[PDB]
Amino acid sequence: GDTKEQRILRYVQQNAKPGDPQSVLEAIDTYCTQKEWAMNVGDAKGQIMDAVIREYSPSLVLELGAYCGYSAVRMARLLQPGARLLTMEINPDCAAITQQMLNFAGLQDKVTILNGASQDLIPQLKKKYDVDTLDMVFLDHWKDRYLPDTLLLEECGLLRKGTVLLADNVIVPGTPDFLAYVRGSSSFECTHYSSYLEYMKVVDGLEKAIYQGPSSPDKS
Numbered sequence: 001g002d003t004k005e006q007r008i009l010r011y012v013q014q015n016a017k018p019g020d021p022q023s024v025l026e027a028i029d030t031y032c033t034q035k036e037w038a039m040n041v042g043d044a045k046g047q048i049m050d051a052v053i054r055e056y057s058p059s060l061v062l063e064l065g066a067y068c069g070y071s072a073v074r075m076a077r078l079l080q081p082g083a084r085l086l087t088m089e090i091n092p093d094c095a096a097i098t099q100q101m102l103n104f105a106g107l108q109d110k111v112t113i114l115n116g117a118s119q120d121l122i123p124q125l126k127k128k129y130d131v132d133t134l135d136m137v138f139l140d141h142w143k144d145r146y147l148p149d150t151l152l153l154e155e156c157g158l159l160r161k162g163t164v165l166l167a168d169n170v171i172v173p174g175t176p177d178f179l180a181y182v183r184g185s186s187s188f189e190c191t192h193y194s195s196y197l198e199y200m201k202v203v204d205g206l207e208k209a210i211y212q213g214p215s216s217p218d219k220s
């Protein structure tokens with residue numbers, strides 16, 4: 001039984017070149033803009049992601065919401081040797097697509113795919129995936145989970161001063177609880193990157209929130 005996600009993967013395999021992540025990105029963006037809409041960061045937002053990756057040169061990245069693997073390919077292709085992407089995907093079939101997408105792109109050695117819910121997997125990272133702290137987190141999963149998973153990352157000790165969080169769709173459909181919290185909290189230094197939705201003629205944006213450390217207890 002044919003699914004949209006299988007169709008995306010098929011289009012890449014036919015038209016992109018194996019071992020060429022850039023051709024894979026172009027294939028998906030072409031498919032989604034010309035053939036069939038799909039939840040896709042798209043190339044405009046993708047360039048903001050690229051710039052963030054290049055600026056901070058993360059050695060360990062956590063992605064929430066891999067879907068078909070476009071963002072995983074986008075980020076992993078800019079990771080240095082020894083750098084790692086951990087990506088989480090709650091749907092088993094999408095997780096399988098993401099693995100095949102990364103395999104095709106030649107990036108499978110840089111990426112660990114975890115199939116499960118963010119709130120179940122995030123607390124296992126220190127013990128099971130030998131994580132200390134994360135250099136960067138990309139949020140693009142269920143929008144009502146941005147705030148609680150950010151709070152969970154903090155309390156699990158996975159954030160350090162300087163950790164970049166980059167969150168997509170903070171305007172459309174919107175994550176106002178997440179935005180209120182990080183912008184108002186002194187634990188996060190925030191900036192907003194506006195970008196037009198490729199399909200919709202509505203303005204969206206990514207929020208970049210840089211962790212400053214835990215807030216200090218009240219003194220004497």
Ligand SMILES: COc1ccc(C2(c3cc(-c4sc(C)nc4C)[nH]n3)CC2)cc1
Nearest residue numbers: 065066067088089090117118141142145
């Ligand atoms: C209806 O809107 C959607 C639907 C699906 C998605 C995707 C997604 C979400 C997750 C979740 S959810 C959760 C609690 N932990 C994880 C890891 N993995 N992949 C991207 C496929 C994003 C937005």
Ligand code: NA
Nearest residue numbers: 041140168169
């Ligand atoms: Na998105």
Ligand code: NA
Nearest residue numbers: 182183185188
């Ligand atoms: Na803030």
